[PDB]
Structure formats: structure tokens, C-alpha cells
């Protein structure tokens, strides 16, 4: 059945208390698990009364530890690219369990560098990306993942 004037698109939103903007980095849970997984929100929207988030993956090192082979960096995670499942997913709203503060530290020009300060009260950090169908890791951010330029994946216009 088709659907049509059941659904709109935000920019942001407000849950439990805290402000979130398209973009911004949260904790979601899975239903029965404690344990958090770290996404990026790049898409708002309510369908009916359903509220949804599209939510680009972060990885944490033991989500992808039989493909790692060197060292990781204290609090590194790594921001999913490519094509394929794990590259993003769509969760109720309900899911966001809160905030969750991820810079980026790479080299790339379109990055804003953080400060050391920024990066000590940073909950993670990364600079390296994941491509989730060949499951490796590369220093080289790409144009675009999951139809969004690279420079809005990264840190935020204003410190």
C-alpha cells in the first residue's frame, strides 16, 4: 500500500532531556544488552508516530577483532565506509541511549583539528575507516558514505 503526507524529516530533536542535531555522535542499546554500540545520526524523521534515526556505524575494536592486525590507539573506534550490511541502520528513537562525544583526529584537510584538551575529554576517537565489506581499515577518508559528503562526517564547523 502506498503512502503519502505520513512522514516528515528533521534536523534535530529533543529526548530525555538532551538536544540532538543530525550528525551528532549517541550510545544505542539493543534490546536484553548493556553493552553500547556508537553511531552517527545522519537522517530524522517520523512516520505515523514512529520516530526513526538513520544511524552510520561506528565499530569498536572488539566489535571487528579477528579482522585487526596492529595496534589501536587508547579509545579508538573506527567510522564505517563502503557498501553492504554494517554500514548503517535504521533504529527507533527509542534506541539513543545518549550523547556520545567522537573526534576525529585525521590529518585530512577537511577535518578541523581538535585540541589536546578536546581530545583528553573525548569519549573516542578515530582517524581510520572501515570498509564494511572488505573488513579493513584505511587512513583515506572517502567522498562520501552512505550518500553524505565526508567533511559533514567528521568535527563539527565550530569547536
Not at 505520513?6 to 534490546?31: H, M, W
Not at 541502520?89 to 584537510?109: F, H, Q, R, W, Y
Request: charged share 25%; with cysteine.
Amino acid at each position: 500500500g502506498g503512502i503519502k503526507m505520513d512522514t516528515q524529516f528533521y534536523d534535530s530533536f529533543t529526548f530525555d532531556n538532551v538536544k540532538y542535531s543530525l550528525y551528532d555522535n549517541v550510545y544505542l542499546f539493543k534490546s536484553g544488552e548493556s553493552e553500547p554500540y556508537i553511531g552517527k545520526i545522519i537522517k530524522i524523521w517520523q512516520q505515523n508516530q514512529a520516530k526513526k534515526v538513520k544511524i552510520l556505524w561506528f565499530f569498536l575494536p572488539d566489535e571487528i577483532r579477528k579482522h585487526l592486525s596492529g595496534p589501536v590507539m587508547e579509545k579508538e573506534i573506527f567510522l564505517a565506509c563502503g557498501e553492504g550490511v554494517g554500514l548503517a541502520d535504521i533504529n527507533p528513537l527509542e534506541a539513543i541511549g545518549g550523547k556520545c562525544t567522537v573526534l576525529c583526529i585525521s590529518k585530512d584537510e577537511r577535518n578541523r583539528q581538535p585540541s589536546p584538551r578536546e581530545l583528553a575529554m573525548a569519549d573516542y576517537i578515530f582517524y581510520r575507516f572501515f570498509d564494511v565489506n572488505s573488513c579493513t581499515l584505511s587512513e583515506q577518508l572517502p567522498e562520501k558514505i552512505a550518500g553524505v559528503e565526508g567533511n559533514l562526517l567528521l568535527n563539527s564547523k565550530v569547536e
